[PDB]
Curated annotation (Swiss-Prot):
Record-linked PANTHER family: D-ALANYL-D-ALANINE CARBOXYPEPTIDASE, D-ALANYL-D-ALANINE CARBOXYPEPTIDASE DACB
One Pfam family linked to the record: Peptidase_S11
GO terms for MF: serine-type D-Ala-D-Ala carboxypeptidase activity
Function: Removes C-terminal D-alanyl residues from sugar-peptide cell wall precursors.
Protein name, as recorded: D-alanyl-D-alanine carboxypeptidase
Protein's organism: Streptomyces sp. (strain K15)
Length: 260
């Protein structure tokens, strides 16, 4: 059993559900942007889902990333961006502006505030439906709050559920993506290329996911997944000490899991 810097860790065989590694696996901690996995999951399960549906980037999305010094996809106010493009902006550079856009779009309500509230409710309803008991969302992106928490086991179960969706799988294993959006003049704008923050995609052979996280309370987090020899290992590390450490933590757990 490897030792890791993260104070919380968990991994299982994605196909069988069998546990492969644990370290305070059921201890509630902050999630950082790994919460965005649930945001993507909820969006992709909406009945009225249309990946080609366009969303106008509101000034509020930009003001939001600035006010919260949140990671962003650099979405340009006024641009028309598709839900598919928003999902890539959400998962690759960890676009909290894209998260806001998705919540505004899919929440139920007559105001952005009401729709955001409704969307977070959907996130909690999805957790409940998975039979989770140590997870609660108070945001659509993991930005702030003691009422936003999960555990390495719970997040791994949310990730496993999300990975059942082919679109989700396609997105989280993508290393680079360049969005071509529509400007106010109708012209097509080529945005700066987005790079997936998950270093495992290039450093770990067989890696297929899933999502990074890093904040003042959550520290360095990573939900990982890789497939080798017909076996898929999926897991989560919470509160590692740095980006390089979170990557090695995950690398060790997966290597251990594949050898078990």
């Amino acid at each position: 059993k490897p030792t890791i810097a993260a104070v919380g860790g968990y991994a299982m065989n994605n196909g069988t559900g069998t546990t492969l590694y644990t370290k305070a696996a059921d201890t509630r901690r902050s999630t950082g942007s790994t919460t965005k996995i649930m945001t993507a999951k909820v969006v992709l399960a909406q009945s009225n889902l249309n990946l080609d549906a366009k969303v106008t980037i509101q000034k509020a999305y930009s003001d939001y990333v600035v006010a919260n010094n949140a990671s962003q996809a650099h979405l340009i106010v006024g641009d028309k961006v598709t839900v598919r493009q928003l999902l890539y902006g959400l998962m690759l550079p960890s676009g909290c502006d894209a998260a806001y856009a998705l919540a505004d779009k899919y929440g139920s309500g007559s105001t952005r505030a009401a729709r955001v509230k409704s969307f977070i409710g959907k996130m909690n309803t999805a957790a409940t439906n998975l039979g989770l008991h140590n997870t609660h969302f108070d945001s659509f992106d993991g930005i702030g709050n003691g009422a936003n928490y999960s555990t390495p086991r719970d997040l791994t179960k949310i990730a496993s559920s999300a990975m059942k969706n082919s679109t989700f799988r396609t997105v989280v294993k993508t290393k680079a993506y360049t969005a071509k959006t529509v400007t106010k003049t109708g012209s097509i704008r080529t945005m700066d290329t987005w790079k997936n923050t998950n270093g495992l995609l290039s450093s770990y052979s067989g890696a297929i996911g899933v999502k990074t996280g890093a904040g003042p309370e959550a520290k360095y987090c990573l939900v990982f997944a890789a497939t080798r020899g017909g076996k898929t290992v999926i897991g989560t590390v919470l509160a590692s000490t740095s980006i390089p450490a979170r990557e090695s933590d995950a690398t060790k757990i997966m290597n251990y899991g594949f050898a078990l």
